[PDB]
DNA sequence: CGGCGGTACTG
DNA sequence: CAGTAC
DNA sequence: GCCG
């Protein structure tokens, strides 16, 4: 199915070494490099060909074809050796690519040289406590039992309220790097003021461990960003994020909590070149803030930026099976 | 050459 | 506001 | 990094 396997992996190590630096551009550049490699029909056999492929221009060209006849790629013997360390802080949630260069240079090259002298904020130090746990990902099974969890708390309280799991789980995927569930009400009112008893309840049976963002102060709140753990002797600790929204924005929000990523920039960069704006509340239309369309399903997005409905499944990247 | 998703917490 | 996150 |  790669075609090019060979390739991609050494450029995922390159795009890898320039996320972590913090070069993020040069980065989003080889991430699509490196999905439409994968999407070729058969392996590149020339430089032409490798530059006529959408996402593969001169530089990226060279290195393909280096990589090619040579078997080898030069620039990757030249890596800053500062990178896996620079991996290593950035794994930790709540700190990225400044903290991990702050880090770097007030000289900590391990973990417990941050454990045992770096400044950590409250969400790094909550990151850092749970570095393994939160590097491993979950089988599809145990995410399961994780949506669950949520919905069942949540319908003692209201019944009528809708808890679907999304990200790469309702995208299909066997294993969950962390659970993302969505909660809403058909009645278009009730999703109101959730949050406050939602987490009383998860917290009293011990399932929420740690919260990382959660502004409780706020009786709208809308998201929870936090860390469950599944009762039973040996569970790890999970990553879990919860959103409220109502009814009338649950197509944008599904569509937006469902992912991935990489899709719903390509799709936001799409809207953008129709003179629309798309964001978890609405798809809008003037836009010079213009008006919301509605948007009851879906489909309903889709259809009004001149796409066919994607599968959850096939929602990897959107210019894929193009 | 400049733009590269749009939004929401934290401190 | 910068940093980090989804 | 690439694209318009
Ligand atoms: N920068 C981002 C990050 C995420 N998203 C949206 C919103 C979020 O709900 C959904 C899933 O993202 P996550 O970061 O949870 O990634 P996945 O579930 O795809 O994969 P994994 O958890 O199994 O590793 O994708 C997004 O618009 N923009
Ligand atoms: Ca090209
Ligand atoms: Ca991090
Ligand atoms: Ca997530
Ligand atoms: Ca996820
Ligand atoms: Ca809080
Ligand atoms: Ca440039």
Same mark, same amino acid.
């Given at each position: 199915?790669?075609?090019?396997?060979?390739?991609?992996? &050494?450029?995922?190590?390159?795009?890898?070494?320039?996320?972590?630096?913090?070069?993020?551009?040069?980065?989003?550049?080889?991430?699509?490099?490196?999905?439409?490699?994968?999407?070729?029909?058969?392996?590149?056999?020339?430089?032409?060909?490798?530059? =006529?492929?959408?996402?593969?221009?001169?530089?990226?060209?060279?290195?393909?074809?280096?990589?090619?006849?040579?078997?080898?790629?030069?620039?990757?013997? $030249?890596?800053?050796?500062?990178?896996?360390?620079?991996?290593?802080?950035?794994?930790?949630?709540?700190?990225?690519?400044?903290?991990?260069? /702050?880090?770097?240079?007030?000289?900590?090259?391990? #973990?417990?040289?941050?454990?045992?002298?770096? =400044?950590?904020?409250?969400?790094?130090?909550?990151? #850092?406590?749970?570095?393994?746990?939160?590097?491993?990902? /979950?089988?599809?099974?145990?995410?399961?039992?994780?949506?669950?969890?949520?919905?069942?708390?949540?319908?003692?309280?209201?019944?009528?309220? #809708?808890?679907?799991?999304?990200?790469?789980?309702?995208?299909? &995927?066997?294993?969950?790097?962390?659970?993302?569930?969505?909660?809403?009400?058909?009645?278009?009112?009730? $999703?109101?003021?959730?949050?406050?008893?939602?987490?009383?309840? @998860?917290?009293?049976?011990?399932?929420?461990?740690?919260?990382?963002?959660?502004?409780?102060?706020?009786?709208?709140?809308?998201?929870?960003?936090?860390?469950?753990?599944?009762?039973?002797?040996?569970?790890?600790?999970?990553?879990?994020?919860?959103?409220?929204?109502?009814?009338?924005?649950?197509?944008?929000? #599904?569509?937006?909590?469902?992912?991935?990523?990489?899709?719903?920039?390509?799709?936001?960069?799409?809207?953008?070149?129709?003179? /629309?704006?798309?964001?978890?509340?609405? @798809? =809008?239309?003037?836009?010079?803030?213009?008006?919301?369309?509605?948007?009851?399903?879906?489909?309903?997005?889709?259809?009004?930026?001149? @796409?066919?409905?994607?599968?959850?499944?096939?929602?990897?990247?959107?210019?894929?099976?193009?």
């Amino acid at each position: 199915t790669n075609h090019n396997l060979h390739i991609t992996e &050494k450029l995922e190590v390159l795009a890898k070494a320039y996320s972590v630096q913090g070069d993020k551009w040069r980065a989003l550049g080889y991430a699509k490099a490196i999905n439409a490699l994968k999407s070729f029909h058969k392996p590149v056999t020339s430089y032409q060909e490798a530059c =006529s492929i959408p996402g593969i221009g001169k530089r990226m060209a060279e290195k393909i074809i280096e990589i090619l006849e040579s078997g080898h790629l030069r620039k990757l013997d $030249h890596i800053s050796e500062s990178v896996p360390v620079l991996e290593l802080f950035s794994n930790i949630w709540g700190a990225g690519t400044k903290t991990a260069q /702050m880090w770097y240079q007030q000289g900590f090259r391990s #973990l417990e040289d941050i454990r045992s002298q770096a =400044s950590l904020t409250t969400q790094q130090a909550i990151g #850092l406590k749970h570095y393994s746990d939160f590097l491993e990902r /979950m089988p599809r099974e145990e995410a399961t039992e994780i949506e669950q969890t949520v919905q069942k708390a949540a319908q003692a309280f209201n019944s009528g309220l #809708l808890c679907v799991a999304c990200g790469s789980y309702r995208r299909g &995927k066997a294993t969950c790097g962390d659970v993302d569930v969505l909660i809403t009400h058909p009645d278009g009112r009730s $999703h109101r003021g959730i949050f406050s008893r939602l987490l009383d309840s @998860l917290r009293q049976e011990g399932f929420l461990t740690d919260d990382l963002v959660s502004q409780e102060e706020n009786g709208q709140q809308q998201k929870y960003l936090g860390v469950c753990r599944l009762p039973g002797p040996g569970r790890r600790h999970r990553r879990l994020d919860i959103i409220v929204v109502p009814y009338s924005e649950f197509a944008c929000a #599904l569509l937006y909590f469902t992912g991935s990523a990489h899709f719903n920039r390509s799709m936001r960069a799409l809207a953008k070149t129709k003179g /629309m704006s798309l964001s978890e509340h609405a @798809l =809008s239309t003037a836009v010079v803030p213009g008006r919301v369309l509605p948007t009851p399903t879906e489909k309903d997005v889709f259809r009004l930026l001149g @796409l066919p409905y994607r599968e959850p499944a096939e929602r990897d990247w959107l210019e894929h099976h193009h």
